[PDB]
Amino acid sequence: GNEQIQAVIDAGALPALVQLLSSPNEQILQEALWALSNIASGGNEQKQAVKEAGALEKLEQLQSHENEKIQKEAQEALEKLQSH
């Protein structure tokens, strides 16, 4: 599969930050993830979005993954949105 490519750095906003989770294209998920995943690094504002954005909803599609790296990509938001 394709790894996190260093194409462009971004942040993310609205459900658009989550939307790539439900991508069919696990590869492009991973590609754009590099820019989008930074949301998870911001505990307040960013990391709080994901729940409301539909990360639990988004997760389910990707849980049917064909790529193995994708498990970390899935659990990335899982982890961080859940209270622990």
C-alpha positions as a printed Julia matrix, in Angstrom:
84×3 Matrix{Float64}:
   0.0    0.0    0.0
   0.96   3.63  -0.12
   2.41   5.38   2.84
   1.9    8.89   4.16
   3.26  11.02   1.37
   4.72  14.4    2.07
   2.72  16.33  -0.48
   1.32  19.31   1.36
   0.78  20.2    4.99
  -2.66  21.3    6.11
  -4.76  21.16   9.24
  -8.36  20.28   8.62
 -11.8   21.66   9.41
 -15.46  20.49   9.51
 -16.54  16.83   8.55
 -14.08  17.22   5.69
 -11.36  16.26   8.18
 -13.16  13.0    8.92
 -14.47  12.27   5.43
 -11.26  10.65   4.2
 -11.72   7.96   6.83
 -14.62   6.57   4.91
 -12.69   6.61   1.71
 -12.8    3.39  -0.53
  -9.38   4.39  -1.41
  -7.36   3.44   1.61
  -4.32   4.52  -0.28
  -5.49   8.08  -0.86
  -6.82   8.03   2.7
  -3.19   7.51   3.75
  -1.93  10.14   1.3
  -4.13  12.99   2.53
  -3.98  11.64   6.08
  -0.56  13.15   6.38
  -2.07  16.61   6.19
  -5.38  15.81   7.89
  -4.2   13.63  10.8
  -2.62  16.72  12.45
  -6.17  17.31  13.81
  -5.49  14.52  16.26
  -2.42  16.36  17.53
  -4.56  19.25  18.72
  -6.38  17.99  21.8
  -8.67  20.96  22.11
 -10.55  22.37  19.09
  -9.24  19.82  16.62
  -9.47  16.45  18.45
 -12.95  17.36  19.78
 -14.27  17.81  16.24
 -13.93  14.27  15.16
 -16.76  12.9   17.34
 -19.23  15.44  16.09
 -17.72  15.25  12.59
 -18.68  11.61  12.49
 -15.46   9.73  13.17
 -17.35   6.82  14.69
 -19.55   6.82  11.65
 -16.57   7.19   9.33
 -14.63   4.48  11.14
 -17.0    1.66  10.21
 -16.34   1.9    6.45
 -12.64   1.8    6.96
 -12.92  -1.05   9.44
 -13.59  -3.18   6.32
 -10.01  -2.24   5.21
  -7.88  -4.24   2.79
  -4.62  -2.54   3.92
  -2.86  -3.44   6.95
  -1.41   0.07   7.83
  -4.95   1.26   7.73
  -5.51  -0.31  11.2
  -3.33   2.36  12.8
  -4.97   5.0   10.65
  -8.42   3.88  11.89
  -7.5    3.54  15.52
  -5.7    6.92  15.43
  -9.0    8.83  15.8
 -10.69   6.0   17.73
  -8.27   6.28  20.46
  -8.15   9.94  20.71
 -11.81  10.65  20.49
 -12.72   8.13  23.12
 -12.42   9.21  26.69
  -9.57   7.47  28.46
